[PDB]
Amino acid sequence: MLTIGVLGLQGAVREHIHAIEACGAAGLVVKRPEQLNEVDGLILPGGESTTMRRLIDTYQFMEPLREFAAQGKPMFGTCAGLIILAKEIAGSDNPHLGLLNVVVERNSFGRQVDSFEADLTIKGLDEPFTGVFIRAPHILEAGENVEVLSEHNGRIVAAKQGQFLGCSFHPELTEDHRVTQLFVEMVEEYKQKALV
Numbered sequence: 001m002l003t004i005g006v007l008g009l010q011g012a013v014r015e016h017i018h019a020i021e022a023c024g025a026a027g028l029v030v031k032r033p034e035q036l037n038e039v040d041g042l043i044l045p046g047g048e049s050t051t052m053r054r055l056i057d058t059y060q061f062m063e064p065l066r067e068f069a070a071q072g073k074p075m076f077g078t079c080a081g082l083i084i085l086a087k088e089i090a091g092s093d094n095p096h097l098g099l100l101n102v103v104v105e106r107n108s109f110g111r112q113v114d115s116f117e118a119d120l121t122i123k124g125l126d127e128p129f130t131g132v133f134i135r136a137p138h139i140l141e142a143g144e145n146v147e148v149l150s151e152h153n154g155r156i157v158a159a160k161q162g163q164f165l166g167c168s169f170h171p172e173l174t175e176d177h178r179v180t181q182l183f184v185e186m187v188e189e190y191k192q193k194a195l196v
Contacts (some may be wrong), residue, residue, distance in 0.1 A: 011047025046080025101143035131169035
């Protein structure tokens with residue numbers, strides 16, 4: 001069976017792993033670069049943008065994450081994870097992987113008004129999905145090659161691009177595992193094409 005990984009350098013991983021298992025698949029808390037060879041897909045949990053950035057560097061994670069990407073292995077960037085996986089504003093500081101062709105802005109709301117829930121319409125899911133937004137990043141623009149999987153008040157909140165999947169909300173912070181299931185379906189689709 002599949003084995004989804006969860007970059008555990010920073011943030012919480014406990015809930016993504018439960019989600020992956022719930023969908024019938026192994027989950028591994030990837031804490032070292034080499035472990036990336038042991039998984040069929042990777043979930044960038046996120047949490048704190050800037051923090052996770054310096055962490056992947058002192059841990060020689062960047063280059064390996066790109067090789068992971070080149071192998072066609074699926075990557076799911078949630079919340080801060082979305083920032084790592086995508087591109088930042090025009091002349092922003094120092095970008096990250098920049099694999100998901102979308103431009104993202106970091107949360108700008110204060111600690112007291114940075115959270116909320118909202119029923120979402122996600123392409124692939126029938127019944128609405130409840131998204132937990134916490135210091136959510138905002139997708140300012142998406143390339144002609146990314147498929148919009150969901151939108152809220154005109155803003156793209158979940159996008160898909162080939163092997164890449166991104167969303168600005170916390171899908172694992174609910175008991176509903178349908179979004180994690182979308183990624184798990186993406187990884188199996190990858191297993192059914194990877195010559196090994």
